[PDB]
Design a protein around this nucleic acid. Structure first.
Lengths: 101, 101, 474, 474
DNA sequence: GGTTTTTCTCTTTTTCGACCTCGAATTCGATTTTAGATTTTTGG
DNA sequence: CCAAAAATCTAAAATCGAATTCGAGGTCGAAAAAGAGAAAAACC
């Protein structure tokens, strides 16, 4: 929803520390809400972490922007449900095959 | 038909209104220029001024002094309800001449 | 609500004066005794009618309602005779009064029922005054063609505050048990709860359809008791009309009577049972065709398997579930596989949240048949029904009429669900039911109409900023 | 929690196997019998210690603990002897076991107590197996210097799921009953509930302060029983230590013993009683000084009037209320008028919501004294205490220590409450307590620092809109 | 005996109720693959 | 008789769901309480 609750002591709790550009998804029963990990932040109580294995193709704020392109299923928060595998399948358009040039 | 036993008053179309329940006791109290003839519930108040004035000046005066006229009658018990009638009613504001309206 | 709603409020006034269940038992026993007394007097004196009766002693004549209604009230232990000697010491004769209709050994007893009104109670005069006040307050209920039990429906709905049905949904699933089949019988029910959902058809079809009385089974003891008096209030024949006590997962009866012809039910949800399982209940007559049991957290589809076991060659079936039982891991997946093994599962219809008493989730209904064409048809339904304030909605007789029109002959209506194929459901992993709602309100715009408007916004904006800069003179 | 928390979890494991109150009665009776047996064995054999004992028959020696602890357990009907013959038919000898300490007629009985463990129960073998399983499970509790009853505090707190106290608040109001007064006695309690709040001082002051045992009164029957066993578990002397059953509004006792010297209480809220009133309870010894009664919806301050009746010439008093009893119409206004007639009402201290078990409201405590200076002092307190997840907080010993430091000598600390005057409270309409919290976080800014920042926002904004207009090439 | 004043109820306001009720958000147990190891059986 | 391969059993990370829960913010009904009118009592 609103992506901010207050402070807490930010170190030595095993905090994930939220490195340079991962993305997140909110959540079980929703899978629609999207937020750029801004700089270096928390692991606040429901979050599920999405990044990529590849670096020289993905640059996943690209796919942060690409993920909100499809509200097709994501206009349906209706049933009690997890969606992890389902969006985790497919699809997205890609400028392949002129990679990695 | 419901004005047979609404226990309300139909008010004119240049009025202001103000809450007395449950947003204050915590926070800022809203108010609005109501531009149509209307009625409101148990839980707030409708105000028309009388002719020595310009009504928008009363609106901005109340929305300005809200943060301390809530302070004047804030607690009124630990109940869910809020600001008293009398100490709300018995506040003094500087009311200037018409050119200073 | 014409002359009714006042009497509904009178029952609300009578609701005093302690925690509801305790005095409620005595209230239900009082109205139950009053109704049996009035019905018995209406039988024995429909024509010389006497307020006070006699000791006419003719047993041979007495045994004929003891074959017909199965119970003599008594010579003089009716309510209207007992209503003369109110506040009279003592009150415990009512216990002996419950000895009278409980004779009933000939034939097919249906007795052994009225053990509700016990005694607590701390002194005998407390008992006398309290029970006499209850009898006096229940006597003043001006009811008397003789619709009685809807206030009983109110009082039984006034608790868990269990969850039974908002009664137009029961009328809906009754219309799902439709149509056009004057074919014995109706209706079996596993986990019936109240007799509310077990009422609508034959009460509407008193001599329209003529099949048999009703059968069923229910878990709790006091719910069983209120269910039997609930079904007894509505002027229903003694013929075979009953429910037995037990659990369908532990005491499935009756197998021998019979393969049924229509069933409805409201199975409770997340009803975890003995695992997984210690007896041989895999190898019974109904779960061995599935392939695997229904374990603890997924304890739902045992009821629908037990339902589809007791079915005819033609007669349809209708049950309720919640759509969260969707795939639920591979065990429920292969349960769904044996369900879609044929056109066993005919149709599914969703129902928007809540339309219940603070649950707050959506539901869906599964209509099954061994009456095939065959292809699967997921005619699910979203909005609209209002839900929360009074009941609500409740509920839009034209909307359920047109959904029966859709259910009649297999239309394909967009902005609504439609038919699918067996190839579609094997293309799914047997999902319930994502397909086939389409509409999303993603509405187009115009580039130029938006941008020249935004240019108008700027032409307002910059000169107003200029006027603010004029107003920066301080 | 060091070696404790495991045993707390063991009690949670023992919590089976039906609804909690029913078996809980037998659980409490079992641990009660075990503790009395172990304490009696510890008395009679502190030095030759014998697991199994004899029929030594010496009554003259037997009557001396029957004067000291007032109860012989028995020769051989202790727990440890009975723990040898477990699962032995039959079990009902425990009823006869309750005949043994209930002799106790000499002197000052405190008996007639242990009627909790009744029999239901459906067969005798059910009773044997169930009670033997309960005795076996309670025997395995490895407890044995001998802190025992905090698990009892857990089990009694595990219900209404009544509302008693989160026990650090009880320690707080105990520290309100402080200080420095070795002066008989402590402590009377109207509507005590448990003995939890009636514990902390003398358990902390076992030989520090030496005044007398405890007195009190409580409404419910089973709450009275669990209260007496609660106060009996904590190794407290037999001397006069008791609570009588009844209601303070109906049976106010004891007047003759005595004008008390310190009281705490937790009166329940909105406790409407007989109105207004039919007897002459205006003209009693305690409500006639007020001027008017406490009617039904405002049934709170009858307890605080009954509290201030039973008070010494010097000893302070402390009660709890909720701040919604604020002015509450003119009846409660004139009640407040007679309260502020002197420095009867000394201090009031608010406490932030919830700090309870799902109530969810704030509370406040009123500390009264006939020990004056005099001016009124409304030292109310807001945040901080954490509230909800585990207990919570619970609760910040330095924070209550410094609020006792504030309570010591009358400081005037802003960002916190302070003193007021009698002229201030007659300037109020005796309000409880608006004054005197001040802080509001209305923080100033700078005109120029804000506006040139906004100018930087514009210098970003317009060129980015220009670049959007560049990006409008479609 | 008539008139005026005060009080009481009845009509109409009005201000509270250890609440309550809708949107937003979601931590633990229940349940499942995979990692892996150990044991047993078969084949050389 | 010894070695290798396959199958089963265990830990534990990895998923998954919850006739929901949490809590921010507003009840609506009703008790109860003040204003007008009527009736009764007292005084002239």
């Amino acid at each position: 929803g609103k992506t901010f609750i207050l402070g807490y002591t930010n170190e030595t709790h095993g905090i994930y520390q939220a490195s340079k550009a991962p993305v997140i998804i909110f959540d079980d029963f929703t899978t629609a809400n999207k937020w750029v990990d801004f700089d270096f932040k928390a692991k606040s109580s429901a979050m599920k972490m999405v990044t990529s294995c590849d670096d020289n193709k993905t640059l996943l704020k690209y796919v942060y922007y690409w993920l909100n392109t499809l509200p097709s299923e994501f206009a349906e928060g209706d049933h009690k449900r997890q969606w992890i595998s389902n969006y985790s399948q497919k699809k997205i358009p890609i400028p392949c095959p002129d990679n990695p040039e | 038909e419901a004005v047979l036993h609404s226990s309300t008053k139909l008010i004119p179309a240049n009025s202001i209104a103000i809450v007395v329940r449950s947003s204050i006791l915590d926070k800022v109290l809203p108010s609005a220029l109501i531009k149509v003839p209307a009625t409101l519930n148990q839980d707030m108040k409708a105000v028309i001024p009388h002719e020595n004035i310009l009504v928008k000046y009363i609106y901005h005066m109340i929305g300005s002094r809200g943060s301390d006229i809530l302070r004047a009658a804030k607690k009124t018990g630990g109940s869910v309800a809020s600001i008293d009638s009398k100490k709300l009613f018995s506040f003094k504001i500087p009311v200037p001449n018409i050119n200073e309206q | 609500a014409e002359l009714h709603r006042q009497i509904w409020q009178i029952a609300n006034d009578v609701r005093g004066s302690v925690d509801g269940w305790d005095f409620k038992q005595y209230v239900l026993g009082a109205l139950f005794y009053r109704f049996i007394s009035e019905n018995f007097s209406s039988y024995i004196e429909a024509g010389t009618d006497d307020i006070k009766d006699d000791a006419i002693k003719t047993k041979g004549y007495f045994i004929y309602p003891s074959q017909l209604f199965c119970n003599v009230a008594a010579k003089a232990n009716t309510n209207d005779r007992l209503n003369a000697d109110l506040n009279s010491i003592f009150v415990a004769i009512e216990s002996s009064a419950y000895g009278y209709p409980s004779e009933a050994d000939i034939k097919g007893l249906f007795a052994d029922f009225d053990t509700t009104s016990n005694r607590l109670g701390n002194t005998v005069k407390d008992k006398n005054a309290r029970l006499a006040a209850v009898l006096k307050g229940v006597e003043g209920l001006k009811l008397g063609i003789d619709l009685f039990g809807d206030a009983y429906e109110f009082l039984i709905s006034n608790y868990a505050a269990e969850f039974f049905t908002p009664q137009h949904v029961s009328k809906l699933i009754a219309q799902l048990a439709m149509h056009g089949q004057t074919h014995v019988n109706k209706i079996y029910d596993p986990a019936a709860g109240s007799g509310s959902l077990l009422l609508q058809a034959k009460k509407q079809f008193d001599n329209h359809i003529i099949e048999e009385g009703f059968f069923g089974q229910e878990i709790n003891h006091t719910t069983y008791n209120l269910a039997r008096m609930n079904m007894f209030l509505h002027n229903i024949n003694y013929d075979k009309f009953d429910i037995k006590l037990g659990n369908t997962l532990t005491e499935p009866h009756f197998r021998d009577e019979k393969p049924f012809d229509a069933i409805v039910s409201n199975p409770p949800y997340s009803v975890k049972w003995i695992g997984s399982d210690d007896p041989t209940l895999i190898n019974d007559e109904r779960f061995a065709p599935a392939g695997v049991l229904a374990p603890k957290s997924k304890a739902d589809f045992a009821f629908v398997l037990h339902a589809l076991n007791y079915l005819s060659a033609k007669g349809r079936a209708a049950i309720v579930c919640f759509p969260g039982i969707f795939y639920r891991g591979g065990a429920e997946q292969k349960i769904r596989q044996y369900l879609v093994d044929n056109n066993y599962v005919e149709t599914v219809i969703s129902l928007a949240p809540n339309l219940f008493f603070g649950t707050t989730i959506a539901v869906n209904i599964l209509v099954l048949s061994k009456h095939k064409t065959d292809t699967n048809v997921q005619f699910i339904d979203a909005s609209e029904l209002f839900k929360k304030e009074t009941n609500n909605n409740i509920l839009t007789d034209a909307h359920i009429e047109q959904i029966m029109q859709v259910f009649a002959s297999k239309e394909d209506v967009a902005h609504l669900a439609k038919s699918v194929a067996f190839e579609t459901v094997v293309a799914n992993d047997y999902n319930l039911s994502v397909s086939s709602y389409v509409e999303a309100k993603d509405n187009r715009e115009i580039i130029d109409i938006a941008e020249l408007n935004a240019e108008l916004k700027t032409t307002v904006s910059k000169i107003d900023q200029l006027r603010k800069d004029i107003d920066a003179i301080v």
